[PDB]
């Protein structure tokens, strides 16, 4: 089997992407944030504290003939941006782009933090990291991909995120028409539960490529590119008027600036992030200062290849017995 679903930016900055997911019988379609940096599939629901729901579409398990309560089970997650959610657990039938998993754990939110409430466009998350990060207790549950794997034509999914445009998540096949040139594959460590790999270096604009190992994670659920302070300083030093602002919370630059591209290494191959992808717009409405899309990872404890980087590539998440990552230009 295979599946193919379109993923759509939630706003004009590509802050996140939502993908329609069919849950239950008859189908309830919710727009979820596919997150390769976490491993829980959780949804706003009929159980979510009413005051914490503001415009989201909710899953109502009592209206699904295939929903089953996982007796005694609970879940609780905290994300890197400080947001969080928690609740109880159902299994139900879940379909993505035509691919169906029966008995998928669907984590029903009883409580969500303010940033989730305040985002009316995201109805929940669908985790695509390794199932070792799943937060269900007492017994951890498998991700959608883990459950689907044995049914898939090939044990892979691909992320093809758009710049200011829709893109695609495919399951079980590689669309050879979706990229230019060849896919370069690189090793993955699952030791921390992430799609963790080592970039071979970087270049700033037309500068010569610097060969240096940068360990990080491929994370579709993170908006920006977070890299070591050395690398980030080298980038913003090439932008007139750019500076790190502790009050704003990162590098800012004159909105009138022309941003250089940023290149990262995948083995001997290279992915070029155009300068425009690095512009995340005015720091506040009407400001002539803009927020940068490449920021320091110092204090995160990990480098994150988020959407700014991934949307410049066609990305293969190869869940074979020994997982790998593949990157192509497009």
Overall resolution, Å:
1.6
User: Out of 199, 261, 296, 297, which one is annotated catalytic?
Assistant: 199
Using CA atoms, how far apart are residues 255 and 120, in angstroms rounded to an integer? 28
Q: How far is CA 158 from CA 47, 145, 172, in A?
A: 33, 11, 8
What domains, with CATH codes, occur in the chain?
5-174 (2.40.70.10), 175-330 (2.40.70.10)
* Cα 25 from Cα 309, distance rounded (Å): 37
Neighbours of 214 (CB within 10 A): 20
Phi-psi region at 250: left, alpha or beta (left = phi > 0; alpha = psi -120 to 50): left
Q: What angle do CA 175, 14, 104 make, to 5 degrees?
A: 60
- Please tell me the distance from the alpha carbon of residue 325 to that of residue 186, in angstroms, as a whole number: 5
DSSP helix/strand/coil, 150:
helix
Sheet holding 243-245, edge to edge: 243-245, 250-254, 289-292, 279-282
The DSSP code for 53 is -
Handedness of CA 124, 125, 131, 134 (dihedral sign): negative
Reading the block at residue 182, the tokens are 């060849």
- Catalytic residue list contains 35: yes
Asked about 33 being catalytic, the answer comes back as no
Question: Which residues, other chains included, contact 234 with Cβ-Cβ below 8 Å and sequence gap of 6+?
Answer: 202, 204
Of the residues 14, 35, 88, 123, which is catalytic? Answer: 35
């Amino acid at each position: 089997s295979t599946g193919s679903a379109t993923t759509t930016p939630i706003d004009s900055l590509d802050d996140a992407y939502i993908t329609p997911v069919q849950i239950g019988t008859p189908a309830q379609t919710l727009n979820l944030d596919f997150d390769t940096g976490s491993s829980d599939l959780w949804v706003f629901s009929s159980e979510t504290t009413a005051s914490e729901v503001d415009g989201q579409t909710i899953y109502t398990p009592s209206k699904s003939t295939t929903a089953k309560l996982l007796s005694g089970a609970t879940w609780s997650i905290s994300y890197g941006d400080g947001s969080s959610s928690s609740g109880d657990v159902y299994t139900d039938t879940v379909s993505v782009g035509g691919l169906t998993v029966t008995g998928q754990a669907v984590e029903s939110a009883k409580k969500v933090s303010s940033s989730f409430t305040e985002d009316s466009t995201i109805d929940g998350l669908l985790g695509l990291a390794f199932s070792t990060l799943n937060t269900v207790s007492p017994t951890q549950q498998k991700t959608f991909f883990d459950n689907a794997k044995a049914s898939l034509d090939s044990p892979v999914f691909t992320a093809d995120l758009g710049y200011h445009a829709p893109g695609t998540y495919n399951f079980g096949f590689i669309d050879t028409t979706a990229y230019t040139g060849s896919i370069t594959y690189t090793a993955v460590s699952t030791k921390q539960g992430f799609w963790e790999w080592t970039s071979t270096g970087y270049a700033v604009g037309s500068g010569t490529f610097k060969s240096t190992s940068i360990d990080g994670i491929a994370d579709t659920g993170t908006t920006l590119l977070y890299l070591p302070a050395t690398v980030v300083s080298a980038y913003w030093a090439q932008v007139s008027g750019a500076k790190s602002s502790s009050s704003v919370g990162g590098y800012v630059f004159p909105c009138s600036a022309t941003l250089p591209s940023f290149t990262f290494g995948v083995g001997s191959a290279r992915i070029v992030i155009p300068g425009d992808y690095i512009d995340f717009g005015p720091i506040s409405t009407g400001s002539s200062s803009c927020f940068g899309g490449i920021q320091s990872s110092a204090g995160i404890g990990i480098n994150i290849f988020g959407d700014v980087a991934l949307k410049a590539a066609f990305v293969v998440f190869n869940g074979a017995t020994t997982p790998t990552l593949g990157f192509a230009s497009k």
